[PDB]
Amino acid sequence: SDPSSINGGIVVAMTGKDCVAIACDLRLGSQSLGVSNKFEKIFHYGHVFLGITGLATDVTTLNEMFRYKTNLYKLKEERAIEPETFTQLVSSSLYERRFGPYFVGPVVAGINSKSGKPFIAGFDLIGCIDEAKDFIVSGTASDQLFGMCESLYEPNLEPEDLFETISQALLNAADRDALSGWGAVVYIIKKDEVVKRYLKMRQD
Amino acid sequence: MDIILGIRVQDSVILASSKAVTRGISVLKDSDDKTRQLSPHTLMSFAGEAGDTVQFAEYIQANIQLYSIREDYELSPQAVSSFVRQELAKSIRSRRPYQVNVLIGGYDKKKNKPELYQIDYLGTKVELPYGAHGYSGFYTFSLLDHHYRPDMTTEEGLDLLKLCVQELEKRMPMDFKGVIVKIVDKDGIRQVDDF
Amino acid sequence: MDIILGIRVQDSVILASSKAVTRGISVLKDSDDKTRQLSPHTLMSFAGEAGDTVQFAEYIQANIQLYSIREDYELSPQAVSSFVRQELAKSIRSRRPYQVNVLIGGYDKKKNKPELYQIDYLGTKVELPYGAHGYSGFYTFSLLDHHYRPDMTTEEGLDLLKLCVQELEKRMPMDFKGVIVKIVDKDGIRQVDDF
Amino acid sequence: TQQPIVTGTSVISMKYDNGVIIAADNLGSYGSLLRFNGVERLIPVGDNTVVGISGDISDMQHIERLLKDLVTENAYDNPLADAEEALEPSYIFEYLATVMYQRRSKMNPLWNAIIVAGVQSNGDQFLRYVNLLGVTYSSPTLATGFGAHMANPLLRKVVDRESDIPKTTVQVAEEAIVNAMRVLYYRDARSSRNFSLAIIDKNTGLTFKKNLQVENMKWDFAKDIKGYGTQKI
Amino acid sequence: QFNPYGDNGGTILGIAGEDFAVLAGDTRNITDYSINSRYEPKVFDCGDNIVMSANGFAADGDALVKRFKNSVKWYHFDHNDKKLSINSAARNIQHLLYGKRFFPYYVHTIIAGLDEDGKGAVYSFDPVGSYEREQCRAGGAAASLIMPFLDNQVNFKNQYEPGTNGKVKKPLKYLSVEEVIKLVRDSFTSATERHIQVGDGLEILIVTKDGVRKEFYELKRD
Amino acid sequence: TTIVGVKFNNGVVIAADTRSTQGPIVADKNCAKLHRISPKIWCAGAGTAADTEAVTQLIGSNIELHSLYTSREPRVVSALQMLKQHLFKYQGHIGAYLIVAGVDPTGSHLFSIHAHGSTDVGYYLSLGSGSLAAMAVLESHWKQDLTKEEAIKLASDAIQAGIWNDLGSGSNVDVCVMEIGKDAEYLRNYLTPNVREEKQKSYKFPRGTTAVLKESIVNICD
Amino acid sequence: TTTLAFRFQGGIIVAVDSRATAGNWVASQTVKKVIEINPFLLGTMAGGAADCQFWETWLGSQCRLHELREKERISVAAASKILSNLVYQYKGAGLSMGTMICGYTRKEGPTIYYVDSDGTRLKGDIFCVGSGQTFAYGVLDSNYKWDLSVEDALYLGKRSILAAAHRDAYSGGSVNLYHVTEDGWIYHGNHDVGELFWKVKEEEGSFNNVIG
Amino acid sequence: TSIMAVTFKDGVILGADSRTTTGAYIANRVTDKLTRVHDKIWCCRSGSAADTQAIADIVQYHLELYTSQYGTPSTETAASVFKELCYENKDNLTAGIIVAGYDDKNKGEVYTIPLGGSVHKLPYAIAGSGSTFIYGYCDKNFRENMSKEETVDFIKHSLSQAIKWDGSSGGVIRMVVLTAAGVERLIFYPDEYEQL
Amino acid sequence: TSIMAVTFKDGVILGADSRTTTGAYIANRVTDKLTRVHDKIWCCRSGSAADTQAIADIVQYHLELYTSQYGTPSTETAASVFKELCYENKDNLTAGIIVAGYDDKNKGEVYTIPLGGSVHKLPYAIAGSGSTFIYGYCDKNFRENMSKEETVDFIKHSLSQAIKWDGSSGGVIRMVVLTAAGVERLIFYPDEYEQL
Ligand SMILES: COc1ccc(C[C@H](NC(=O)[C@H](C)NC(=O)CN2CCOCC2)C(=O)N[C@@H](CC2CCCCC2)C(=O)[C@H](C)CO)cc1
Ligand SMILES: COc1ccc(C[C@H](NC(=O)[C@H](C)NC(=O)CN2CCOCC2)C(=O)N[C@@H](CC2CCCCC2)C(=O)[C@H](C)CO)cc1
Ligand SMILES: [Mg+2]
Ligand SMILES: [Mg+2]
Ligand SMILES: [Mg+2]
Ligand SMILES: [Mg+2]
Ligand SMILES: [Mg+2]
């Protein structure tokens, strides 16, 4: 009955020193029944990364829609969309469905290719932008992630340290949530290399 | 409706679907085939709300058959499953949604791989080694978690299925009147007749 | 619970009662005996609300066994069925009623007649040639209206019963896991083991 | 299970260096009808305690009778009734808190919020709150109803933590209380202009002021306000 | 209709060391969007080296603590001044809670002290008297923020030995009272950042064989 | 939220806290509640977060187009009329509660708008969960003829009352000053009275602490 | 929760997980769900945590009083019936319990009774109970034979709970194992799923749904 | 809210309190409930503030367009435009409006438009929550053809009492005088009216 | 129902209309709402007719037993007995009672007991559905220590207006005068009071 907690899942993003990280769990369930162990919640359009938690059909639908819109953007503008701009596109798109919304918690992460700035933002289901220096959290274990991030985090971590910090925030938050976990994926993003790592985690 | 299962082995996808059709306290039919061939190498099983199930299945069938004729070509299992997902994702926000869950089993002739997609009425799609809709999944997923291997033969797949149907006939409260089993592989779609 | 039937033929009463015990989507047991012997020539089958059924059955059993010892004598089937009716008629106006329906099959040794009483949870009693509680009756009454004869043998009664169980296994939506059959006659109560 | 009929609005209070102040207006509302105008909602108990009550007035009157029967009962076979065995503010509070929680636990509450203000026998200030749920708490300032929302923020600017209490005089505290009462009269639709105020000091004892009035009100700026947006005349 | 329950916010936390235990709680007390008090203690010395907190609906919490304190007093009267061990306290508290199974105390209860071998003990309860002994527990409003941090930093969950290819776990080990107080203070400032019902003050009760000590720290007042 | 507006001698000032909530959780510790409608018309918004932001952008866009069309500086009453008529149309379903202020060729102005589309005029206003704490201060200290400095003090004091006393408000004070004949000055994080204390411990992990199953380089190029 | 118990050639296996939930909040990963009533009697716990703990430790007290009064250990039948008659009294009040009373007496042999808060009491050879019962059933039923060796029976029990811990969101933590014989119950350890899942995946080659 | 309009020798006076509440909270203590829809046609508003503002704004627009085309509208015409809006949209509006204006032919007129959108021309009218408390008083003390000073006193005494008993009324008493002379705004503060 | 009691120089007068309704139907147009619970202690009843009769009957019984044992009860005592019944049974009663009596020591007294069972001693009191319409009027016109003829006029004018505006009030105006002289019943018919 609550569309935001039928399927389960989480996304978290963090800034570091000239880098950003975005991670997500792999679970897709139908209430108590775990169904898929490979359901990834992070996508990318050029160098801009989007994580989406919530109702899985809307996660899929929004990915296909933002791929659609960013493809046309690139054809008309003749350049990849930047994270600041993409964040605005996400907001307008969500708010356009104000009274019949997508039941999602999206998260944008990327480095602006002109300025080199790391950039993260989160949104509510209706498009309200939450821009943050440090971290953004989303999904069924968001209380847990807020607790982990708010204590584990410190500014200016090097890529290999940020990896450890974000991974521990995600893993320990997920283990306190029945509807999150079943695998995880972490993206470490620097100005021009992106490393994607699958974490080992408890499978219950 | 009620029981539909799918297993993807080495070189085929197998769909098993119960034969019972029930209204109130009467089993009206015990040989119902809860399936439509969408194209020569793609099969779709379905369960859910009475009337909705067949209407949706046949509507998809008509669209895929129309595409086939227009392009003189067969859409890949992945392409068909995305088309189906989108129809259900539209439907869930309509005045009256289709209350239908589906499994799509197809053999992709370009990749030479069997493929199994599980899609619910919300348009929630997932590709899986094995799948189930309804209460079935509460027994068969853990059973298959244990007995399933990625490299099994069509024949090992059928035995794995017999295990599933045995458990369901033991623990499920309803009499679903056995299953019709269909195999999808490089040579198309065929029905096993004594199961 | 769910299926309990009774047939009274020439010289015996036959009770058939399903073996399934179900909670949610799990058949917890498939050999449940939904019956208690009240006295050497009186048997009671029961169906209804979980817990209530057995608690009521055993409570009646304890009372009849107590009466037997006190008077060194066996109450007639009619007397027992009236006692049972009264307990249910009290119960229906209690703070929490017993939600239990029963069939009482007994052989009255003074009359040399078999007797079958059908009593619902309201304390509604009726003596019948054949009876059923639950959805069963919607198939078996008309079937027995057709095939039943007053002068049948115990063996003809068992065949008549096989007909009932066949229809129920064909048309009933649930898997009730077969029946345990018991015969009540001038020599007491015995169980048929291969049915 | 109950609904309040005739009600009293806020009760506000604070500690200062030598004592406690507590105030409450003199109105008994009947929904939106300002029905009764001379209602005393501060009830003194001995010479060391004032009990201030908001919420249902029929229940307030019941609580008065409980308190006045408590005094009577405490005097019985007690030769030190006006000395070492006089009722402390803390005794009176615990009794009321006990009653409130029992009544909520029987699903038949006394529909009130109560503040007990006084000075203990050792000179310590007493200020504690209890309500219809039997919830209790203490703080350098305490208020009920709208008072919690509008008075507490003002009174906290004067006493914001325990260490501000020795630094606060009875003149400062009373001024802050009297100002808070004016604000509540501006902003609470079930308040009245008239109120009572009581000071319980470890040196001067209990002073109880009746028939106070909200004074020094700014209304003049109203003459310049025209329409609701575009209207000029 | 009359609602017999409210929610007074706050959060609590208990950690056990080898020869001590802490029980911490913020000192804020709230209803709805209002602060009732910035300093209202909800962690108590109950005698016999047992500390107790019952966090949630304060009226229920106070009633429970009072009943348990009184239970300790009568245990002495009835059993020749014998010391009530922490395991015995916990079982007694289960019966206090379960006696109101059909009209619950709306609290999450934690007690701390030392077991009968002198080792630190933390016991925690659900509202109707389910209980378990652990190294570690947070309760109340911010429990969902603090608990997973405690799993990671007190019991080394998800932490492996570097270079072992995630095959050898970080080995369990007791923490000093100094390390524990650091985790408590960080837990509460983190919780104060993200939960509106947590703030103002932190009061920690430490239990050793020499008795009960208190420490107090300021928390953000917004 | 807490938000305010205060008129002075030669203009108007608005201010707001910077907390955003989802249930009892702080979603954003430093959001921006002050919105530019035009260069000298600014809006403070409480209520449904995205609604305040969307309605303020839509009307700001239309005001810009109107300003271009008419070759005039936009007026506060135009923003007010467009906002009220838009909100009225939606029967309160767009949950925006707004304080609108600015200077235009007509003078200096201060209004409030409720979600159902009703408007007020005043010299001092407050809206949001913290509006009663703020209005307590405003009613206590406001006078006719305030200087710019006095108004900024009054306004940020009013917001502070909300920050400390309302659980729905916290973090920082933002201000905007609109004076006749000058550029509007937006003072982002004018006050920052809620800076996190230093943490007790660094939780930076030994590299290799986290067990990994696979790695790969992601292709973000062409 | 997931719990199970089954009879076989070698006696009785009893296995349980160790998760406690408050909705979707994981309340605990280390909770005991078997109560050792006496050296020949075990009780399993599923449903309301307090209901299970409270009434099953109460059951133990009643069993202890039986042996003081009768100078003989209580039958599995009689012990299970004390609990079912108790919960029947509370029927409608909202108790939530799914329990198995597992033990050995000489007059009965190894015996399992299912008892729940509806008042249902059933003797039987195999039961799984709790939110994960179906998952355990699927594995347990499809490998069960009367003749399992003690070693295989123990594994199946462990493997069944692991299956449920993996697929059921409201089961997990660790497996607790018991074997009951004519000489009483024997504990066979705590097995954290954190390690057990990966170990079973490697050695058995199952769980191919999971990213390896 | 307490509002009234009273015809007299030279024209008509409108009066109102200045309180608007959200529940028991006073959202605005200096509200202006007397609103101009034409030079010498005003109304007092009660009910939903959003509804009555929306209505008054639409009426002001209609009468400004009427004026452009046909000259000064009659007070009856203004009341008819209010009614049309209130009656046709009765399901979605909570508006109780008193219309008052001064023609030179017609002198002072008062029309009251209660909740259902019916219209009633009257010598005087009272409305708003506070009005219930002064039906007795106003009926006893009103006379036709009073003077300006008598009428101001009647209104001041009436609204004084409405304010005294009604928690939803309060603040200042505002009045608008409509005569051949023009338009005059009066205000009266608590310290004056409270002790009448 | 419209009811009131007014203290004055020589004692106290009670007054009431005579209408009782079931919905919009007038079940009794000549009701007597002024009821004696002692020689010179009377009450006026409003709310549920069954409840207020049941209460008054119990009070009359209590005061007759008080009298037997302890002599004439004070008006305060009578009001306390009403309160005890109204407060303790507040969930099950819909009673709004005004108590009025004459001691020789205490002169005239009036206590009002509204719905929740609180007690309020007052110079005068009004209650019943019709009372809302005369708060303004009564507050303006009441003075302490009026004469018998002044007080009768006050009540007659007050209840006249309550009756005029309230559909649930009507019929005749009954009054009971309580002084050292004894007890006097007055009645006033529509044709007199309607055109005041
Ligand atoms: C009707 O439901 C509501 C209404 C208002 C709030 C408070 C508001 N928070 C939000 O809007 C958050 C980001 N989003 C949600 O709570 C998601 N909602 C789901 C259902 O519909 C509404 C959207 C919020 O934080 N408001 C702030 C001011 C915002 C801050 C962000 C910048 C824009 C203005 C303020 O009013 C104080 C904190 C309380 O409202 C929550 C739920
Ligand atoms: C009647 O309502 C119910 C029923 C069942 C549950 C699940 C149960 N959890 C709890 O009991 C939790 C800790 N506490 C509560 O839910 C709090 N009370 C519930 C009863 O009403 C008052 C509030 C739980 O975790 N059950 C476990 C088995 C327990 C674990 C603890 C030891 C005893 C056995 C299990 O059934 C799986 C996890 C499914 O819950 C919750 C509420
Ligand atoms: Mg998890
Ligand atoms: Mg699990
Ligand atoms: Mg906080
Ligand atoms: Mg409306
Ligand atoms: Mg007023």
Class of domain C1-195: alpha beta
Decide: F105 and F72 in contact? Cβ < 8 Å: yes
Locate the ligand 1 atom nearest the alpha carbon of residue F32 and give its number. 32
Decide: F19 and F109 in contact? Cβ < 8 Å: no
Does E102 sit within 8 Å of G93, measured CB to CB? yes
Name the DSSP letter for residue E57.
S
Q: Name the residue among F21, F68, F24 with its Cα closest to residue F46.
A: F21
Domain count for chain D? 1
Q: Name the residue among A20, A60, A67 with its Cα closest to residue A39.
A: A60
Give the bridge partners for F114, in sequence order.
none
Q: Give the minimum alpha-carbon distance from E119 to chain G in angstroms, rounded to a whole number.
A: 19
Decide: C43 and C189 in contact? Cβ < 8 Å: yes
Give the bridge partners for F62, in sequence order.
none
Cβ–Cβ pairs < 8 A, chains D and E: 51
Dig out the tokens for G136 from the structure.
């355990």
How far is Cα F208 from Cα F124, in angstroms, rounded to an integer? 58
* Residue with token string 């004949």: F181
Q: Which fold has domain E1-222?
A: Glutamine Phosphoribosylpyrophosphate, subunit 1, domain 1 (3.60.20)
Q: Name the residue among I113, H25, I118, E2 with its Cα closest to residue D111.
A: E2
Domain count for chain H? 1
Dig out the tokens for C173 from the structure.
């939506």
Does H26 sit within 8 Å of D219, measured CB to CB? no
Dig out the tokens for B71 from the structure.
């392009």
Q: Got the DSSP string for A127-180?
A: --EEE-SSEEEEETTHHHHHHHHHHH--TT--HHHHHHHHHHHHHHHHTTBTTS
Return the H-helix or E-strand segment holding B83: helix B77-91
How far is Cα H71 from Cα E173, in angstroms, rounded to an integer? 93
Residue C47, phi then psi, degrees to nearest 5: -145, 160
Q: Name the residue among D64, E185, D129, D5 with its Cα closest to residue I91.
A: D5
F39 in contact with chain E, both atoms CB, cutoff 8 A: no
Domain boundaries defined on chain G = 1-212
Decide: B38 and B117 in contact? Cβ < 8 Å: no
How far is Cα H159 from Cα H131, in angstroms, rounded to an integer? 8
Distance between Cα G168 and ligand 4 center (Å): 4
Q: Name the residue among B147, B195, B194, B193 with its Cα closest to residue B7.
A: B147
Q: Which residues contact H118 (CB under 8 A, 6 or more apart)?
A: H83, H87
Decide: H5 and H44 in contact? Cβ < 8 Å: yes
Query: Which of B10, B145, B159, B166 to probe the G interface (max G CBs under 10 A)?
Result: B145
Q: In what order do the strands lie in the sheet with H108-113?
A: H34-38, H41-47, H95-102, H108-113, H120-122
* Residue with token string 């570091």: A16
How far is Cα G141 from Cα E140, in angstroms, rounded to an integer? 42
How far is Cα C75 from Cα C44, in angstroms, rounded to an integer? 14
Q: Got the DSSP string for D10-67?
A: -EEEEE-SSEEEEEEE--EEETTEEEES----EEE-TTSEEEEEEEEHHHHHHHHHHH
Locate the ligand 2 atom nearest the alpha carbon of residue G131 and give its number. 39
Dig out the tokens for E24 from the structure.
């911490």
Q: Name the residue among H189, H163, H186 with its Cα closest to residue H174.
A: H186
Decide: G156 and G13 in contact? Cβ < 8 Å: yes
Decide: I15 and I153 in contact? Cβ < 8 Å: no
How distant, in Å, are the alpha carbons of G100, H146, H195 from that of G7? 12, 104, 92
Q: Which residues of A touch E188 (CB under 8 A)?
A: none
Beta strands in F58-207 (DSSP E): 96-104, 107-113, 119-121, 124-127, 173-179, 185-191
- On the CB side of C64, CA atoms within 13 Å amount to 28
Return the H-helix or E-strand segment holding F78: helix F76-89
Residue D145, phi then psi, degrees to nearest 5: 60, -135
Question: In which region does residue I53 sit, left (phi positive, over 0), alpha (psi from -120 to 50) or beta (all else)?
Answer: alpha
How far is Cα C79 from Cα C82, in angstroms, rounded to an integer? 5
Q: Name the residue among C130, C175, C178, C184 with its Cα closest to residue C26.
A: C175
Decide: G129 and G143 in contact? Cβ < 8 Å: no
What b/e sequence results for A96-115 when a residue is b if at least 16 CB atoms lie within 10 Å of its CB, and e otherwise?
A: eebeebbbbbbbbbbbbbee
Name the DSSP letter for residue C174.
B
Q: What is the CATH number of domain G1-212?
A: 3.60.20.10
Does F129 sit within 8 Å of E193, measured CB to CB? no
Length of chain F: 222
Decide: E122 and E110 in contact? Cβ < 8 Å: yes
Length of chain H: 196
Q: Which residues contact D29 (CB under 8 A, 6 or more apart)?
A: D6, D7, D8, D9, D35, D190, H167
F48 Cβ below 6 A of ligand 1: yes
Question: In which region does residue H175 sit, left (phi positive, over 0), alpha (psi from -120 to 50) or beta (all else)?
Answer: beta
How distant, in Å, are the alpha carbons of A148, H36, H85, H102, H178 from that of H14? 64, 11, 22, 11, 8
In single-letter form, the type of residue at position B40 comes to P
Q: Whose CA is nearest to atom 3 of ligand 1?
A: F48
Dig out the tokens for C42 from the structure.
């009186």
Decide: F96 and D206 in contact? Cβ < 8 Å: no
How far is Cα I111 from Cα I78, in angstroms, rounded to an integer? 10
What domain range is H128 assigned to? 1-196
Domain boundaries defined on chain E = 1-222
Burial class (CB in 10 A: 0-12, 13-18, 19+), F19: buried
Q: Got the DSSP string for D85-123?
A: TSPPHHHHHHHHHHHHHHHHHTT----EEEEEEEE-TTS
Dihedral sign, CA of A65, A67, A71, A74? positive
Closest chain H residue to F114, measured at CA:
H50
Q: Whose CA is nearest to atom 1 of ligand 1?
A: F48
How distant, in Å, are the alpha carbons of H137, I3, I5, I132, I162 from that of I165? 11, 14, 20, 10, 6
Structural domains in chain A plus CATH codes: 1-204 (3.60.20.10)
What b/e sequence results for H131-166 when a residue is b if at least 16 CB atoms lie within 10 Å of its CB, and e otherwise?
A: bbbbbbbbbbbbeeebebeebbebbbbbbbbbbbbb
Q: Whose CA is nearest to atom 26 of ligand 2?
A: G47
Q: In what order do the strands lie in the sheet with C35-39?
A: C35-39, C42-48, C100-108, C113-119, C125-127
Q: Whose CA is nearest to atom 32 of ligand 2?
A: G49
Decide: I167 and I19 in contact? Cβ < 8 Å: no
F30 Cβ below 6 A of ligand 1: no
Does H133 sit within 8 Å of I133, measured CB to CB? yes
Q: Which residues of B touch C20 (CB under 8 A)?
A: 173
How far is Cα A66 from Cα F191, in angstroms, rounded to an integer? 39
Decide: I2 and I173 in contact? Cβ < 8 Å: no
Decide: I184 and I10 in contact? Cβ < 8 Å: no
Q: From the CA of A183, which ligand is nearest?
A: 3
Q: At CB < 8 A and 24+ separation, what contacts does A157-161 make? A: A157/A14, A157/A16, A157/A17, A157/F204, A158/A16, A158/A17, A158/A19, A159/A16, A159/A17, A159/A19, A159/A188, A159/A190, A160/F207, A161/A16, A161/F204, A161/F205, A161/F207
Q: Which residues contact F25 (CB under 8 A, 6 or more apart)?
A: A142, A143, A146, E194, E195, E196
Dig out the tokens for I102 from the structure.
């004459």
B21 in contact with chain A, both atoms CB, cutoff 8 A: no
Homologous superfamily (CATH) of F1-222 is Aminohydrolase, N-terminal nucleophile (Ntn) domain (3.60.20.10)
Q: In what order do the strands lie in the sheet with D194-201?
A: D141-143, D11-15, D19-25, D194-201, D205-213
Return the H-helix or E-strand segment holding B143: helix B137-147
Decide: B91 and B97 in contact? Cβ < 8 Å: yes
Q: Which residues of F touch E34 (CB under 8 A)?
A: 165-167
Decide: H30 and H17 in contact? Cβ < 8 Å: no
Dihedral sign, CA of G188, G193, G198, G200? positive
Q: Which one of G25, G48, G93 has the shortest CB-CB distance to E144?
A: G25
Ligand 2 binding pocket, CB closer than 6 Å: E 104, 126-128, 130; G 1, 19-22, 27, 31, 33, 45-49, 52-53, 96, 130-131, 170
> Distance of alpha carbon D25 from its chain centroid, rounded?
9
Decide: G160 and G144 in contact? Cβ < 8 Å: no
Decide: F41 and F100 in contact? Cβ < 8 Å: yes
Does G167 sit within 8 Å of B141, measured CB to CB? yes
* Residue with token string 């429970």: E64
How far is Cα I177 from Cα I102, in angstroms, rounded to an integer? 10
Show the CA angle centred on residue E162, arms to residues E157 and E168, nearest 5°: 60
Decide: H101 and H41 in contact? Cβ < 8 Å: yes
Residue H20 DSSP SS3: strand
Does D4 sit within 8 Å of I87, measured CB to CB? no
Q: Which one of E128, E134, E144 has the shortest CB-CB distance to G30?
A: E134
- How does strand H20-22 pair with strand H182-188? unpaired
How far is Cα F65 from Cα D109, in angstroms, rounded to an integer? 60
HEC string of chain G equals: CCEEEEEECCEEEEEECCCEEECCEEEECCCCCEEEEECCEEEECCECHHHHHHHHHHHHHHHHHHHHHHCCCCCHHHHHHHHHHHHHHCCCCCCCEEEEEEEEECCCEEEEEEEECCCCEEECCEEEECCCHHHHHHHHHHHCCCCCCHHHHHHHHHHHHHHHHHHECCCCCEEEEEEEECCEEEEEEEEEHHHHHHHHHHHHCCCCCCCC
A191 in contact with chain F, both atoms CB, cutoff 8 A: no
How far is Cα F190 from Cα B20, in angstroms, rounded to an integer? 71
Beta strands in E105-173 (DSSP E): 107-114, 120-125, 131-134, 136-140
- How does strand D28-30 pair with strand D6-8? antiparallel
Q: Name the residue among B1, B36, B6 with its Cα closest to residue B132.
A: B6
Binding-site residues of G for bortezomib, in ranges, read 49
- On the CB side of B140, CA atoms within 13 Å amount to 26
> To what resolution in angstroms was this structure determined?
2.4
Give the CATH number for residue I153: 3.60.20.10
Decide: D51 and D43 in contact? Cβ < 8 Å: yes
* Residue with token string 């009951």: G180
How far is Cα G116 from Cα G1, in angstroms, rounded to an integer? 14
Burial class (CB in 10 A: 0-12, 13-18, 19+), D72: exposed
Name the DSSP letter for residue A3.
G
Burial class (CB in 10 A: 0-12, 13-18, 19+), B111: exposed
What domain range is D196 assigned to? 1-233
How far is Cα B119 from Cα A28, in angstroms, rounded to an integer? 12
Residue I82 DSSP SS3: helix
Query: Which of B5, B130, B140, B143 to probe the G interface (max G CBs under 10 A)?
Result: B143
Residue C83, phi then psi, degrees to nearest 5: -60, -50
Q: Which residues contact G102 (CB under 8 A, 6 or more apart)?
A: G5, G12, G14, G41, G42, G43, G44, G76, G111, G112, G113, G178, G180
